[PDB]
Design a protein around this nucleic acid. Structure first.
Lengths: 213, 210, 210, 213, 212, 215, 212, 215
DNA sequence: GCAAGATACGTACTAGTACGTATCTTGC
DNA sequence: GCAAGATACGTACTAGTACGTATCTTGC
């Protein structure tokens, strides 16, 4: 068990380094200094900065805390989005998801062998799973393209987050994520599921409080 | 005036290829073919260059054919921009300018990524108010938050497009984004009038090249 | 590809200002802002530069809006070209290219002034045959001699315009030249259809800038 | 009288130099060597290369031999044009008119103080005089712009000549000058004066023969 | 684990060499690019020379092949046409691009790289294929497989050089297909020649199958 | 002052070539070229302004002042002779140092630092090879609609590689054999009937053409 | 005849100086430009210095004036606004442009040009005008014509310098009119101030009349 | 390694300025700057890459590190003090060698050879002068719709000339008198009532401001 | 407190230029 | 045959670079 704890001490250190200076500018020593583990300690778990970065990308979907199982399936999606918004904002929520976001958004190069496809594909299928469930519980309009909507939400979320970083340091992210869902859902969500959805910041906070405890 | 454009174009292409922090003046010099001396007249630092390319995407990006249906103009703008980003030598400025704005970097690099975004946002809002007054969108829609939503929404659709299929699907992805965002604020029987078609998309590309 | 255009433009402006024989590579370097090295990739001699700018006035000069009345197209071409020559930064290539062709120099400078003229002549002839087949000019008109007459006629009208009122009157002088040459070969009731007006002249200027 | 002959020996030498290398490239020594006169011989008549060039421009209208006084005034214009065409072609006709043409067509610079306006203004008024006479002898249509036609002919002649130099070394100039007049005259010349005009090369040669003798 | 870190370094080395060439490259460049530790590097490779020699020793060894073919000459043709795609784009295989630069660049005898070793292996690999095709009855009776193998290896490398110089490798596929189209009439059995597929559209299909 | 200008210019060119061939473009210095040429600094800088200019000028001398082959009966033999002659010229410890330097300058890569035009010697090579094939087409020794342009790109292309591989394997020792191989295998795909057996691929001939063209 | 050849040389000298400045200029440049003989040149001027000094000694002397005015301050204003046009275009007067460069450029005391001489004359010329306007009752009682003349000469030269640097003399006319608009309220009699015409359209009309 | 970098950089800048002021841009050499600065070649080239870069950097130091005037009661007096202070600074056998070099570099012309940006020091001069006038407008010491921008171009413009003429006539000896003249005559055209008599145009003050700002 | 690195300064070259002298060309 | 000039070569610098060592910074 002393191996699985020290690997996470490495991964968080790498992600922390990657968040602040990007994949390019970061060195293996940067990650080594932050983690405060030995050269050989590192070498057991990760062979290279690439292998490090790929792993922090790989644990982006599994990293996000899952909310208590909601009765309305679209509300789960709404709550998850506003949780992720609160997680990125205050920071102290999660350290991996920040650097893993920056690793995915950063353009980089084909010469660096990062696979930004993995955290983005797996994120889309997860969003598709919820929308596929919500359809089985009859929450979405009869002829909606569940696949195109997953891609759209996964896209739009990334960019609403990008803008919110630039303009306000993510201070308004809650309001903007809420805005995205408040405007996107009238197109595919059943009317009446629309009146039943809880957009308020007061509710979304009471999910951030509950996820920690 | 002549060399500054040649420099800025070359700067954008280098910034697109390696990103701000990896890039050097040296690389921009070599890619521009201007003399050492010709560059320093205009730009002393790499920081000065990047800032200049960012403030350039305002007036470098080609304007759209004016229309009475202001939402179709807004739809054209984003579809044109979807093709500009796809190209390579369609516009070298926008591609580098995007990568400069989207990429995070550091506060240590003093680049103001806010002002291209400030411009992008103010422009889409100005067009939506010109759609509001002409009775195209619901009477009391939050125009400021909508434009902020459109800028943000596009940015991510673009990023997601870039990673997944080297920007190739961006035309369709922006079409979906506009189709799905519109019913939340468009007035009745306006969505049906709007032209989302790919063969119109490549047709507005011709009228912009001046 | 990028620098070659920047070089050629700068070469044309220097050639316009001082003429071929007075000009040096040194002057073109300084006016272009490209490195010594960047120029030699493309051009070893001053002769090589001039020849390149001459062969450029073929494809650099912007094309005219296609019309069913082929003589109106021919009239537009020469009126557009009358405004291109008047400017300064409208097109720097044509102005230098003209001065290079018109000026006499020497046989010692190996410049082939024939091939821009060969191009200019063949182009106006090709348009006149497209007017002949569409029944716009008298059935058996000497098309080869007419185009040669039009190229020659323009060249002098231009020179005379340049000397007398710094090219300012060229629009009117080319209008007169077309008005007076037309009845000798135009079919009945075609001269009356043709639009010579100055406010059309400035209007075709917009559609050419691409 | 030994002064007026030696001044023309200078002027022809200058014009000859100016024809072959233009105003710019030519030196005062170039003119001095060709003329074979002394430094002081030159200085009496001309102070500078500019003063030289201006003088050769100034004697362009007076230089052209005037044809025997024709009955048809437009035929005089036609014959004069085809004479000038023959004069430039064979060369041996006149040495001044070649260099004086090149001095006028060459763009030069505002920094050189040549006045290319003089040979061109005086050439236009002369063409206007003929067209003004032809009107008094009723050879031109009732509402023709005599001033615009002088400018047009003076222009078009310069450029028909320019093209003919580039393409054929002026070999076809006769045919091209003829062509210009054959196409320009239907617009302003009276019909019937048009049938009375002699365009043939055989006639125009018999003016070149006669002008020498 | 150790083959993992070796590969990471080799790929980075191959990139730097393809970028700046042997002389201009530093070991310092290769370190920053691999993203391994100083210690990790100096265990597998001591000097710049050893790095270069290793990438060279992997040219044939790490070249992605094809689906096994009925015609071993079409196997040969598809491999070559694949290499033309594998050399052009920003994504190919860095090992190939790297060693191709290392082999073709002259340098000097002052540097101690063995350029003959990748060349020998690539010639032998080509020969082996032509030998395999002789027993399967594809090539004609009195053919010199050695001399033909040397021809192909040589011809390809220069077809590839001209292409880089003139079109930045753009026309490489058309140049290679051209090469194989004129050379094979000399040694292929007629009946193989008409059953051969040089087509550009087939070249895309072998490239799409190479996403594996 | 023409004659002596040509003489010193050639000393510089031969010296530059030798330097380029032994260290390449980037490693070479003007310093190196001065030492070997024997010329003064101002003498060289009168003729060539930069290392690039020097290097370009040797690539120019690959085209011009390349030993002329005799006017042959068959245009293809004239092409075969030209290829095997160059093979001899790249081989020997002198032959031409200019052809050796040029090939190295053409085949090496160099950084995006340099502005050396490698397209130019290759274009002239291809245009000359095309011209020989087009003359062979009118004589009817090649197929009447064979792609004369695509073949020239093929020959220039392949030869360049045949040479490079030969340099690596045998220091260009076996070059002429390899070039003969190249031609023996490529010609049948576009040569007319009868024409192929008439050609003389022998090292017995390739050397007679060599010593004749040396004079 | 001799004043003819002197002028020809001086104008050419003034051009070269305006183009390359004093130090860069050669006498060789001035010869080729004047188009006179070596002998003709060396009779009037021996050295580059003597050439430069002569153009400088002609700054006021060869400056085209105006039609005589009712208001001597509007005479002053029109002259200054004329100079702004006479300095901008490719055609002005080369003597002005030349000497203005010669005066404003620093050089060194190592060269022996007297920059004070054109400056003295231009200051005296300005003073004389203001003195002429005092007796005609245009300027106010307790005004220092000397100090004002020095101000104007100084102010103009720098207004002219800034204009060259920022707009390549494009805005010089607007800058000079601006200068005269703010300075004159200090010394002009009110009643002259409202009768004064700074207008750009009038500036064109004085320039059109200067075609003589 | 910041502190010592600033120290050597300033030695180079002061030395460059001195050189530029005495021979101008074109005549000056890197050689000259090395000799006077005392610095090694590699030391200078670490900080400045070309003569242009040097010359630009001294024009940059005209703006920054120009002696600050005290926060005055009247914004126009603060402008009057700034002008007369610079007049003292251009005058004295030291004062600042940087302001002297900068002025010469700005006012000279140079060939189309050089790529020195003279617009930049002038723009900063004009923008600072405009800022002072705009603050004077809010305080209501100037006319409420006076063209604050056109005045800044006027002051920078005229001062530059007042100085140039002063250099020629009296080696800048009478500069402060001339500058006082300039201000006494220009201010009434845009100053509010009362404001003008409150201003202190005296050389009695201009020197008190000088020694205070020197410390 | 110190290992990594960033930064600052130093040395030894090579590249580039300005201007000087020599030597051929050429048009009478 | 030779004066003007164009051209070729020479000398003495200054500019620019590559790579070396020293010295500070900084994040644990």
């Amino acid at each position: 068990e002393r191996a699985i704890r020290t690997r996470q001490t490495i991964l968080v250190a790498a992600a922390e380094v990657f968040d602040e200076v990007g994949y390019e500018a970061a060195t293996i020593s940067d990650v080594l200094k932050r983690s405060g583990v030995t050269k050989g300690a590192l070498y057991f778990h990760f062979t290279s900065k690439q292998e490090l970065a790929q792993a922090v990308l790989a644990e982006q979907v599994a990293s996000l805390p899952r909310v208590p199982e909601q009765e309305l399936k679209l509300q789960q999606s709404l709550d998850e989005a506003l949780l992720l918004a609160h997680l990125l904002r205050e920071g102290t929520g999660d350290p991996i998801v920040q650097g893993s976001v920056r690793l995915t958004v950063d353009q980089g190069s084909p010469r660096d062998h990062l696979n930004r496809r993995v955290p983005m594909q797996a994120w889309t299928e997860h969003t598709q799973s919820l929308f596929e469930e919500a359809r089985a519980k009859g929450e979405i309009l009869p002829h909606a393209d569940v696949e195109a909507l997953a891609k759209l939400f996964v896209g739009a979320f990334t960019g609403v987050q990008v803008l919110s970083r630039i303009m306000t340091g993510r201070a308004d992210l809650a309001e903007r994520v809420a805005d995205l869902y408040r405007h996107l859902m009238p197109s595919f969500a059943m009317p009446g599921i629309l009146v039943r959805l809880d957009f308020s910041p007061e509710r979304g906070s009471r999910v951030y409080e509950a996820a920690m405890k």
